[PDB]
């Protein structure tokens, strides 16, 4: 049994600036930063004014204990790395290229030109 | 300096003072402890200290660097119009959340005795509180 | 500070252009969806705001939206506003992760807006615009032009990893200089207060600072101290500027490679004469005056006889002080720069003897004498006009009759009368205006016979430091002057964007045929062009006896049929008319038009100068025209200004530029303020919304074929890794495959072509290619972002401790 009641507080004041509402854009940010996802139906079910306690009853529920980055490699492979860079930018990701080489030389740090996604499900599992 | 003298002799047992108390003292003097300072001087002197000891720790906690432009830092990075201004639960979940985190009634008391507005103005709040 | 007049044409920028898709294919709205409006009651309440965020509600129909105000923050209230009032929001993208507008994904007005806003309060005031350099004014020092910043952007292997700064443009512009052996011109351009003489000082700076020295440190130190001197003699305190440059400058410049001035050249024109004389309340005159004043020794005051700041009729007696400027320290400055263009100090000494009896000149008081009705000097002030010419090294008898014996012509006969009072004090006030101005154009001359090439200049790095389009509701003479010299350099603009764009073009093999220009040739006409424009007819007039200012408005109502660039005003058709300029309809009011432009001393009062003994104020007025009869153009201020403009322009033509646009973000001089309605007027008057338009228009995307490669290999990842295709091939196949027409991409001789609707149509297809992707593409990025924050919130911990620490302390007070 693992209280995340901490981190979930912190987390939500860091993607609302301190305050104890949040943005629904940046309510999926913070659920995805804990390797939550929501199907466009339940996320037109959310409140529009989203609050701290919603969000600890919300994560209390979505989060996986077992198995938090479930969305990058299920336990129930392999990309080549400039790939990976290409669906990155394709997606537009807000990542700039220095965040995306330190998760690269954190990740592969034997320069593969191949890389897990069950390694980067470990090593973000590591940094929460 | 006599004031450095007497307050160690409320406190003082066996001729030592002990870190917590040592810090009281630090406060009833005007100095601002951290524990930063308190974790430098029980690395140096264990937990209990002689008065040269606790004398050279009130020198730890004088920072005179301190100024409301060092302290607003935390603040003014939340603050993302820069309006100078930040709601009251704004610094409360700052002060309660990292650093030497105080008890939400400790933040909620420090933030309704300066203001009861809930918008402040923390280089004034800053302000305040270095005096 | 913000009007009612800069709110009227502020809304009449504003447009609407792209339409919102708040709406999913199902007709339900995108959960969280933020849109731009300018309808809120924050706008109405607060001028400095002009467009506020809101999220678009559940349920909101497609014709009427229905939102609620998040930022600034507000009540919750939902209300209704029409979809011409929302603009797309460029949500989630950082401002700071890129230099140039138009990477923004919409850039609409409030986009634009909120871009520049966020960088700027994040102390990052420069911002692109290709080919325009935007740079707002913090109004404090944001240690950024240090000499530090100076060799970082110096030595900096690729100049790319760095953000946009003046030092970018100056580095560039003296790569290309050095690379392709063309000279190169920076404008400088914007309204008062709004950073153009720090920008260009920042840039000289740069210029002058070699990698390893400068053998002609002599004359890169005379050009550096020409700064002071030009300032102290052509800079005033204004209402909007403590320092304000009442003069346009022009400076042509030789530069090693390395770094380090080795010649240069230095032009000014329209200086301010007028105020010379007399000051708006709250205004100084030249900083000159008072420094001088107030700096000049006990032995120099001695000598010069010189009273109080407060003492002086030409000196607005309270005005005298300026907040935060030391003027007894900038005279020390000014002193030791004089030295540095190599005057002696007989040289110093009778440039402030001369500017000593301009002032005193400016006491003496002329009284009526009535036997007729002449003038006369007051007896008790006939000292202090004989000193006053002493100190000019001018005849003080023969000064005395130019301004008390007037000689007519009537018949064909001379004859000789008197000015009354009036006419001999506009004679005083035009030899005060003179000498001073011909003091200021004499120092100049002397600089540039110590730092021009004997030969001419081979290749130079111009500058020019000007206002841009200004535009009051009355407009006058000045702005007329400044607004076509604008003109000038938007021709300029858009000709060198088109000539880049259809170079690629036709470098590629690409079309042309559907380029855009929008010229301005027709207005630089009805301004201009000799016989039929409004310059010719301002001269006419002013030449031809009788002339009126409203007599010069008729003409060219009757004369100027020909284009709709000119336009009869509707109130008082007489005195005041239109133009349309480039950035919209600028009205002009000709009262004192033919006063202001024949504002220039002629006749006999010139010969006197010329006969001084002083070698110095021989020089002044050298080998000016004899004007025995009538009056001639070569002594009109419009027709000497517009030839030294095309000789101006000819050789701006000559180079290559680079636009700096500079902006005042808020009329009160202070720093982290930010005023929407006035710097979108501005975003107008710089033409910065027209330069994005611009770029879009055809086919703005271009990429090499490897380039497009990796970009938009998933569009068809069959078509981009078939090996038995050349790399032009496999881009002609992706884009046939894609669902683009044929009208939105073209294949030149090595980049792919895109219409901008057609880059972000084939973005969206491979995102769609992707679907499988997008979840742990959003839980990498969000949880990266997570620690993101986190770090920037560990730097200012040991801040937090502090906080905490004395709270505590303050705990124990009770
Ligand atoms: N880059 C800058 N950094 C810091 N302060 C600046 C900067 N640019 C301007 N300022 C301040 O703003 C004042 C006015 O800027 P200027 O460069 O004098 O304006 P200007 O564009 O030259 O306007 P005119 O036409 O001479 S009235 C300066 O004297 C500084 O106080
Ligand atoms: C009599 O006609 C005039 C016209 C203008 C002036 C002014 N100085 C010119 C100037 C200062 N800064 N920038 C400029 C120019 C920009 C473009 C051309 S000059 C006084 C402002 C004075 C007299
Ligand atoms: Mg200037």
């Known amino acids: 049994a693992s209280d995340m009641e901490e981190k979930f507080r912190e987390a939500f004041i860091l993607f609302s600036s301190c305050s104890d509402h949040i943005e629904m854009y940046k309510f999926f940010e913070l659920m995805n930063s804990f390797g939550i996802i929501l199907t466009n139906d339940e996320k037109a079910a959310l409140p529009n004014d989203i609050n701290m306690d919603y969000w600890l009853n919300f994560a209390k529920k979505h989060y996986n204990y077992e198995q938090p980055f479930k969305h990058i490699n299920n336990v129930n492979v392999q990309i080549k790395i400039d790939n990976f860079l290409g669906i990155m930018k394709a997606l537009d990701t807000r990542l700039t290229e220095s965040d995306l080489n330190i998760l690269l030389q954190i990740t592969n740090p034997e320069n593969k030109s191949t890389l897990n996604l069950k390694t980067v499900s470990q090593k973000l599992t590591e940094s929460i | 300096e006599s004031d450095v003298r007497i307050y160690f002799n409320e406190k003082s047992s066996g001729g030592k003072i002990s870190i917590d108390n040592a810090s009281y003292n630090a406060r009833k003097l005007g100095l601002a402890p951290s524990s930063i300072d308190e974790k430098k001087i029980k690395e140096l002197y264990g937990d209990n200290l002689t008065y040269e000891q606790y004398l050279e720790y009130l020198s730890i906690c004088v920072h005179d660097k301190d100024n409301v432009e060092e302290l607003i830092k935390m603040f003014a990075h939340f603050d993302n119009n820069c309006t100078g201004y930040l709601t009251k639960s704004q610094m409360k979940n700052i002060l309660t959340t990292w650093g030497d985190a105080l008890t939400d009634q400790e933040a909620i008391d420090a933030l309704n005795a300066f203001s009861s507005e809930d918008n402040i103005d923390y280089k004034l709040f800053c302000e305040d509180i270095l005096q | ?814």
């Not at chain 3, 009007?3 to 708040?22: F, Y």
């Not at chain 3, 964007?497 to 010229?519: M, Q």
């Not at chain 3, 593409?777 to 401790?801: C, G, R, T």
């Open chain 3, 1 to 814: 500070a913000v009007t009612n007049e800069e709110i009227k044409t502020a809304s009449k920028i504003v447009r609407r252009v792209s339409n919102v898709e708040a709406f999913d294919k199902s007709g339900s709205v995108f959960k969280g969806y933020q849109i731009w409006t300018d309808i809120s009651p924050t706008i109405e309440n607060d001028p400095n705001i002009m467009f506020v965020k809101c999220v678009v509600q559940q349920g909101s129909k497609k014709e009427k939206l229905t939102v609620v105000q998040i930022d600034p923050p507000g009540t919750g209230t939902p209300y209704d506003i029409d979809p011409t009032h929302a603009w797309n929001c460029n949500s989630q993208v950082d401002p700071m992760s890129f230099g140039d507008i138009g990477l923004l994904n919409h850039t609409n007005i409030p986009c634009v807006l909120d871009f520049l806003k966020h960088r700027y309060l994040k102390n990052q005031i420069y911002t692109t615009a290709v080919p325009l350099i935007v740079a707002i004014n913090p109004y404090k020092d944001l240690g950024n032009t240090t000499n530090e910043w100076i060799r970082r952007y110096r030595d900096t292997a690729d100049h790319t990893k760095l953000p946009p700064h003046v030092f970018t443009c100056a580095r560039e512009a003296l790569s290309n200089l050095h690379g392709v052996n063309k000279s190169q011109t920076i404008i400088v351009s914007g309204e008062s207060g709004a950073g153009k003489t720090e920008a260009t000082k920042q840039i000289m700076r740069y210029f002058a600072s070699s990698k390893s020295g400068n053998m002609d440190l002599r004359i890169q130190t005379a050009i550096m101290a020409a700064n002071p001197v030009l300032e102290a003699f052509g800079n005033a305190k204004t209402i909007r500027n403590n320092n304000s440059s009442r003069f346009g400058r022009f400076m042509q410049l030789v530069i090693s490679h390395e770094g380090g001035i080795r010649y240069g050249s230095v032009v000014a024109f329209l200086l301010e004469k007028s105020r010379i004389i007399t000051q708006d309340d709250n205004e100084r005159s030249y900083h000159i005056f008072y420094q001088f004043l107030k700096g000049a020794n006990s032995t120099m005051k001695s000598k010069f006889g010189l009273k109080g700041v407060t003492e002086y009729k030409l000196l607005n007696p309270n005005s005298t002080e300026v907040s935060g400027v030391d003027d007894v320290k900038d005279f020390e400055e000014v002193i030791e720069s004089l030295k540095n263009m190599e005057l002696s100090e007989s040289d110093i000494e009778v440039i402030f003897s001369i500017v000593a009896g301009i002032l005193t000149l400016g006491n003496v008081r002329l009284i009526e004498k009535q036997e007729s009705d002449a003038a006369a000097i007051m007896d008790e002030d006939m000292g202090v006009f004989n000193k006053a010419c002493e100190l000019m090294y001018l005849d003080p008898e023969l000064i005395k009759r130019e301004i008390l014996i007037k000689v007519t012509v009537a018949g064909g006969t001379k004859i000789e009368g008197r000015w009354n009072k009036n006419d001999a004090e506009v004679l005083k006030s035009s030899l005060c205006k003179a000498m001073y101005e011909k003091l200021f154009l004499w120092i100049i001359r002397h600089l540039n016979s110590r730092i021009e090439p004997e030969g001419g200049f081979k290749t130079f790095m111009g500058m020019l430091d000007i206002f841009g389009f200004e535009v009051f509701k009355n407009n006058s003479l000045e702005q007329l002057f400044i607004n076509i010299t604008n003109e000038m350099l938007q021709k300029n603009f858009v000709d060198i964007v088109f000539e880049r764009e259809s170079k690629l073009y036709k470098d590629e093999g690409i079309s042309t045929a559907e380029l855009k220009y929008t010229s301005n040739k027709e207005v630089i006409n009805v301004l201009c062009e000799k016989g039929k424009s409004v310059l010719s007819y301002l001269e006419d007039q002013c030449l031809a006896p009788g002339g009126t200012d409203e007599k010069f408005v008729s003409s060219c109502a009757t004369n100027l049929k020909e284009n709709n660039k000119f336009t009869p005003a509707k109130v008082a058709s007489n005195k005041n008319f239109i133009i349309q300029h480039t950035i919209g309809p600028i009205q002009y009011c000709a009262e004192s038009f033919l006063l202001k432009n024949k504002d220039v001393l002629r006749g006999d009062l010139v010969e006197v100068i010329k006969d001084s003994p002083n070698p110095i104020v021989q020089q002044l007025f050298e080998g000016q025209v004899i004007e025995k009869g009538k009056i001639a153009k070569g002594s009109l201020i419009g027709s000497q200004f517009l030839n030294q403009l095309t000789s101006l322009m000819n050789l701006i033509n000559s180079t290559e530029p680079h636009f700096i646009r500079c902006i005042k973000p808020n009329e009160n001089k202070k720093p982290l303020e930010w005023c929407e309605p006035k710097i979108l007027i501005q975003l107008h008057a710089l033409s910065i919304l027209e330069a994005l338009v611009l770029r879009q228009l055809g086919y703005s995307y271009r990429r090499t074929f490897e380039e497009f490669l990796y970009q938009y290999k998933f569009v068809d990842i069959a078509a981009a890794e078939d090996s038995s295709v050349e790399n032009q091939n496999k881009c002609v196949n992706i884009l046939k495959l894609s669902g683009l027409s044929e009208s939105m991409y073209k294949i030149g001789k090595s980049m792919v072509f895109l219409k901008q609707e057609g880059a972000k149509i084939l973005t969206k297809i491979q995102r769609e290619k992707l679907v499988e992707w997008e979840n742990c593409v959003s839980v990498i990025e969000a949880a990266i972002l997570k620690h993101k924050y986190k770090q920037k919130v560990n730097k200012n911990i040991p801040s937090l401790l502090r906080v905490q620490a004395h709270i505590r302390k303050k705990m124990v007070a009770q």
